């Protein structure tokens, strides 16, 4: 049952693949460092104020040496980076939570339209995986430039917070700072609010016809003792973070769970750096990736005889059974039928699905259409849409057009989706897009215009298809290093298994702050 | 052959009501989003009906095309309406495509929920557009017009009829269940599919006054713009059966109005603004919604507000916490929630009065209304102050004497309904018969049992 | 919308078909009467005892001119007929019940394998359709020929009675005669027992070291006054039936339902006698049957262009929306696929399914196999087996081999299955069977040209409707002209069951 | 607390009993082997083809030295043995499955009435006990002797497969040989099909106007590559079984369960050979059986003073708390009443029930009848039929007539029923039966003193354990000394089913 790798670790293919992937990883880890440097500018200006930086607060919030998975760290990159939020999934007092912090250190917070989207998305992760939501809030509010592309749709964040509370998923918010206008409802719709003495203020309209101090209009002490909008008053930031840990640590949260050994892979995950060809067009076997993420490198291959371009099978990752769907060519009618069936089978055995995209879309042509490519692809999509088992997507290569849909891309609601930095997501390949514009224009003509239309269109598309663009549009939950792929999937499966097992005390209207 | 609206005239029941939705979607954002859509009747069955508008530059689907399809799907799901679509159909597509998958995911789920989809293909449905019939339950194909393929002929050379014609799909592939001879025969066949379902037989079995004043002179009730604290009760009087209305907790707060009325036999509870929402109006409102959940009474939100009250008093008297409670009820209440934007809808006042992002079941706007993040009033103050103190009336009060009247002027209904901030604009004089129809839709859905299945109906 | 028939109304082949069909009806109808006749040749013994005959019992129990659907009247025709039971769905005091009387005018009641089988099936019908079970009992014991062979499996009937009580479906039993040995438990596991004085005895062992009058042992008065195994003491058969109506009449059974308009067909239902070729080998279009059962003769044909040999489509029957599946040729991969889709659609709309069987089975050959005939036939079976909507089968013709399965024959638990008299059910055609039996054994002199088409002639024994109804492969034969009103009645029953709430309990009602 | 046995351990009657019992075990065990023997007389034909024999297939599929409970090994012993099936509950990769292999070393697999029956019963066992169904298939078709008699009811097996898939109980099928005609649907309605290359064929009709290689028609490669009716292509029998383990091994099946310590009996279980009088007519105390199966030999006797002829009480078996009901005499009104109460109590505490049958049935006579024997027997049956807790039956002795019913014999759906070899199941004792048949006919010369006790001798044919196990009246015969570990294993299975959640779906998994 173990996969035989055909991979040459002291060879010219490998080393150049390692080279091109390390280039990509460094490439995105550089962009990350850049945001970090930009938030050391504010350090002294924070330290003047006796305030910890956002990531200093998280460092004190989180249990030391505990796994932390950060999400959408580059969301919104150059669209007006991280969306104004630092969020992730980690531990707070042995309780796995969705942890958030206004990135105050850059643009005093400020929340971009991709900030709306990221918040919506983190809320969906909190809901689906039943994670308590801990927020260290200190924000400027949304960019004034983007009222319209935000305002009405930004009510959904509040709607969600009201629903999370009724679902029985506790919200704890430390207000380190400003929480003004519309965004004062973010602590207002949390269950447990901590307010920092002197360095904190919530109100709908600030001072700038009545004349008032900010502390007297909506400062900490005002809330903790007059209006009752908070439950705890904290001295400073460290003490605020202490209290967030106290709260969390006083819930009997892990006690609600019921009470409930594996072989490592044959090949080391290090090797994943050289598995994808540097030559993007060059085919390879998704099983080479599988062999380095699966326990014992063991993969039970499903229906490979019927079709080899859509690869299905079973494996374990750190003990957890899953079903895998990956791509070694276009999705043919047979491939979609196989996949649909495989997904219903995993539904039947309560097996989580893992989708590794390297998809170029569906096979096309008269044979394909006459053999049911539409009807079979529809059934695959139906199966992905309707399966209730957890779906985990890893974009390892292509994610093109309807292949993206069929392999459980963002719009199909995977539990989690992460992308390799070599990956590409796009409505189609550049070459196909440009070719087609040539052809419809070749009739609706100067030969050079055609050539230029085709090729420019192509480079334009292929340029946009970069992982960076995908992740920046929240087409994924984040970029990961290929070598993290196994331990990431381990963590994510743990997350989904506990969610399945956890009972919640729901209520009609959400907890009422009387 | 027939045109978009000609198909619809023929699809729908002669003289049955028909409520059209987001007519002006995407107006000047480049209108109606590629789609003529609404709620009407086919063989006695109330459906969500939608037809490609190929006239207006071939239709197209685009940022508002996607929003409008997503929104219509939500309306079909929450109100349990069979979806009957007459389709025909790259500018925006690199950008929209990932999120565009939600339309397909929804189709798969709607099929699993037990709400059938009937699609007539009158023209080309290609690449991604091929999956909307794909993911329909009943598919009618028009002989020699319809074409379905993941890739049209634009390195094989095939004719488009050889590759995805009506006859290929009806006869060989099995992609469709019916072959129609022309536009009108497709439409007929769709009516017959609808008329052949036991849909209304799934429901259980089941008199009023009319208001005192005519409901046909109401183009004069609201002044031009809407910010004015003018009287929502005036409107209530014109919508409410026998103009009878029972003020609720009026004496506790005068500005946030609340009470019961009966529209066309249907009880409901109204939440209105004649002013800002103070911390008492909000408590009052949260309480009332909660009472309405208790008695299973539907909610009407008349938007005519500028936001919550502000000042040290409001903040001391718990405006955040009572506003929060009002949002909690708006969000978690299960009774249907109907919204009419009659005037101002600003800031967190739009949210708390159940504006779009609080998912009213249905939300409609008066042409005179204005939805927006804040007022020109507070705009020039922010722009000023965010450059001021981040020394003159040259670049202090010049910014407000301009920025006020940029937004306090532009802030059009039209932008809201184009951004899909509402489900359309309606003549204010239509408001009673409108709400009457929406309540009836909401009630039919409350009573309708569906037959769900695990994976959607498979077209094997 | 409507179907346009092309079968010549004043035709010749019509009149031919019409004559042949009428001959088959007359045949089985004749045979029904001869079981009535044999029962009537005990009017003296009954009249002497002062008893009503089973069918007089039933005519008094049933409502005046209400529909009454008799079930499995020829069951067990020759396997030693009707099982020793007369049963059906009719009306007692406005309530629709599963009604049953021991046929004690024939061999004195008495139960065999076929009687066990008919009883389990009746019990399934009541369970699935939520029908109060009214039983006019008078047997004694089972055929001693088979008792030892059968007594273990016979316990399932008692198991079912206990479970029916726990489901909240009342059982009313009038004991008109003897019910002794293990059959004492049939009244024993009923909820309401009426016991007729002087004529009625229940005990686990009759007189055959103690000596006793069978009345001292277990007569009506003993069970009503001393032991308390009965609830009502009736004076005579008529008084017993009377008490059974009054029990049904005092239930708020119809009050449990919620509260709740059609065109007739354009072509008279009488025409259904002359629709099926007199020559069964001739092929006909099933839509010609459809056009006489469907309101307005309207029929929406589904996916006909993908495969016209498995016909599907929608219709209304007395306003009831249904989906129909028929055969105009063998079942192809495409037809199976299509039918499986169609059943899923009907489930999705909560639309009942009608199966008109005229199959010879599935298409064969490398192409069929290559195109997925097994996988697709499999999906059609999955859909048939798992669909929640009511499934009604009318065997109108062929029902052979795997096509029998795929079209919701017995083993797939249709809710009801009635066969037309020309129908034929068999593992295959006699021709098909001889040939094969030739060619397999042929290569494992003159014995081919005869052993072949001699087995073919036999196989058309285990193949007439009669052998089918007798084996309980259908719930009865019916005159084709009843087909519309039949399905109407079945649809009503199915719809009422769907809507009806029941008061379950843990152990059944306890006769303390 | 403990029971104190008085059966002489170094006794004579013990040794007598012990010898007689051992003779009956040896008997049936011998007969089990002779079915193994007849299968082994095809090692050449298998070895030539390069096949593993059914039992080699099964030994490779099962986990090393895990328990394996074989079911209905003598089914159909002489009604033309084991059904053409070898089946049981054992372990595949840690998972407990219902495991089945076509017995294609005997008459080439092949299915009859008894094979239909054994299959429906296996399917019930899997459904009720939530066991993945692993099937190593190789048949061809059914006995052509019975195919036409049986093909309609045979569809129920396919119905069950479709429903098992919809329940969320996975079916894994390795096709080692042919599965043609209607039996193509057995792999067709399985969730995972493994098809062995070269040896394996599925088609609806084999070559016998088109001409084709059976491989062009439906061989492994065709179904795996072209049609897609299989999921895995195995090289050989061993490789197929291999793939079947790996499928089971990759399910998170045991991960679905929640997480979860006894005294042995004071008296060795071996002693159970010498507990039952060699002379069955002799009466014994059932507590002597109890004292060897119960932990600590402890037994809490329930309501013994009300009636000591129906014994009830509580015990633990490998820590499992159970309630037990046995027979030390016929069933009185008081004993029925008591047993019915006892079952209700066991339900209330969620305590499983063991039925040890040694009944001759119910008490008779005017007093019995007067004291409510029918009503009370009825309540006992209601309780047996309706109780939700697992019911396990061990036929240790007599199981006659209505006592068979009341003690949860076959027709009351015990979850499992195994019979000891001395056991006897019959509508009554042969003596009882002759006498009666005398006296009824006697008054309706020399023919009494012989027709009487000649029918008595016959009736002890339809009465040995063998005729019972062959008719599927039990799930198998078992060596009395296995009784404790048997019940242990059954209790575990029942407890795991209770606790196990399933992923239902609407139509079963679709092999698109």
Residue numbers in the entry:
A (entry chain B): 2 to 81, 89 to 216, 223 to 274, 278 to 461, 469 to 538
B (entry chain F): 52 to 81, 89 to 147, 152 to 216, 223 to 274, 278 to 461, 469 to 538
C (entry chain D), D (entry chain D): 2 to 81, 89 to 216, 223 to 274, 278 to 461, 471 to 538
Task: Show the paper's wording.
Geranyl-CoA carboxylase (GCC) activity was first purified from a Pseudomonas organism grown with either the related acyclic monoterpenoid citronellol or geranic acid as the sole carbon source. GCC also possesses 3-methylcrotonyl-CoA carboxylase (MCC) activity, and 3-methylcrotonyl-CoA is an intermediate in the complete catabolism of citronellol and geranic acid. Both consist of two subunits, α and β, and their holoenzymes are 750-kDa-α6β6 dodecamers.
We first determined the structure of Pseudomonas aeruginosa GCC (PaGCC) β subunit at 2.4 Å resolution. The structure confirms our hypothesis, showing that GCCβ has the same connectivity between its N and C domains as that of MCCβ. The overall structures of the two subunits are similar, with root mean squared distance of 1.2 Å for 464 equivalent Cα atoms between them, consistent with their strong sequence conservation. The overall structures of the two β6 hexamers are similar to each other as well, with root mean squared distance of 1.3 Å for 2,866 equivalent Cα atoms. In addition, the C-terminal segment of GCCβ (residues 526–538) contacts the N domain, while that of MCCβ contacts the C domain. The long helix at the N-terminal end of GCCβ is disordered in one of the three β subunits in the asymmetric unit, although this helix is fully ordered in the GCC holoenzyme structure. Interestingly, the side chain of Phe191 in MCCβ is located in this pocket and clashes with the second isopentenyl group of geranyl-CoA.
